[PDB]
Amino acid sequence: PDDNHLSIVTLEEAPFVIVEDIDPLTETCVRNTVPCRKFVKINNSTNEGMNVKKCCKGFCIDILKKLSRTVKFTYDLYLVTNGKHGKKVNNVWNGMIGEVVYQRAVMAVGSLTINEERSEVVDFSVPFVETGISVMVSRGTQVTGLSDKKFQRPHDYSPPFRFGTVPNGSTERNIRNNYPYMHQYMTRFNQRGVEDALVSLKTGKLDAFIYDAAVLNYKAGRDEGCKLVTIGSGYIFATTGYGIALQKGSPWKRQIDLALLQFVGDGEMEELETLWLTGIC
Amino acid sequence: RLKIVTIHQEPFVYVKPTLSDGTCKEEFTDPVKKVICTGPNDTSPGSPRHTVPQCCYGFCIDLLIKLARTMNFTYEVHLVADGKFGTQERVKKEWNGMMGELLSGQADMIVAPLTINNERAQYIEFSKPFKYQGLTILVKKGTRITGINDPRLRNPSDKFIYATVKQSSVDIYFRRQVELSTMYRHMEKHNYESAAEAIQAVRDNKLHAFIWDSAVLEFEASQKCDLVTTGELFFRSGFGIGMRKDSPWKQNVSLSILKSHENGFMEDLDKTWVR
Ligand SMILES: CCc1oncc1-c1cc(F)cc(C(=O)NC[C@@H](N)C(=O)O)c1
């Protein structure tokens, strides 16, 4: 109960975190949403900016709501502005990871992948969504997985496969560490975001998109005509999960872990999965 | 020097007799890595536990060796004396199985297909998952069940026998669940001492459905064509390394597991022992 009003950072990534504009007449978030603020700059010649009141919802926001109630904390939720999920740049963490490392946030809640390098600088909860690295293609495209030789040695094929990721996250880090030739080749096809990547696929400009498995599976399930698919038997390289990142030695981790495991045991996680993640395909 | 506890559970842990000279049969897929593991020769209920050297290998044993080389520790392995995974029972409250052995200091680390759950996490430290799986149902190639919501499970009788393994975290979950009541208590009447006994009992038409780990059941059906899984994965969850809360190895165990997922080692183990 003591010092239980917590700074919490998140990051938009549907359906895990969805950001809406607040009703301006009321400045109240309604329904299934929670208040979340975003620092927006006045201009680019200045550090001056203002917090905009927004509204947040989604799978991870419902997790936060349950945690808040179960673990008995209140919070001030904000959207990260210094980068995205988390990357080490010149030995300095940005994104949600950076916000936790440098103690601006007590925890980070979102589509944040647990990996070894982040685990060195933050504590992670137990995984609450299963993920890893999947590959999305148009139905019928024959590729075995990340490990396919069309990815590993692309210039052995004529024409070579055109494939990319969204840079600066856990997926790109993994490819950079494991498959150097693939990685340097892929940078040509880097995508600004998931939406751009899906458009590139649907119009024939990219042959595959390599990305977080949970997000790809979601997008595959919502795809018009069920053209975009993930390869293999729901297949995932480097199986991991999303985790709540907490500061090293955090006193909140114990209770957050138990709560998450209780949600799994109680069927509450399955309910959330059915609410947010089920698709037509 | 760490005391490791594990349990017989193919394809994670194979258990075979030593040769007459007390070493393990040389086998090949690349050499199969094997360790000496002590275990009881009497499996029975309420019996004296006479320990004997045996040979242990498989996915969990390869994982152990990787951990020990990575983190520079020595070990001795033994099979859990009571043959069980571990549940908490009223005596006021006591853990059996591998959970009991770790909490008492008989083991320093559990390396086994041990499900991470709330009830165990209250008392021990689990690593990040070394395997993601869930529950499924094993039946005779022949039987037709939709899955866990079939009437014959939901509203059961002595007509259609099904069960899980005793003192597993499946078993106590069914006995405990309110909507499970009629199946909860029904499985109590038929639950088995081990997974191996349950699987053979399905082949010999003594057990019609066996509710258990998908990682074990899918493997069993891949090998024995008279067996099949049915229904979707449910209760998706992980296996974790188990340690006491004050273990000094806990951070490095998790980092090593994360490293192994990311560098393809866990996938290699899946291709060696599971695929
Ligand atoms: C958080 C998941 C959970 O919460 N309550 C029950 C379960 C569950 C889920 C599952 F896939 C397997 C087992 C289990 O008991 N499998 C036998 C064996 N691996 C064991 O550890 O006892 C238990």
Ligand SMILES: N[C@@H](CCC(=O)O)C(=O)O
């Ligand atoms: N979930 C990822 C972002 C997407 C990806 O790179 O796969 C992360 O935490 O970095």
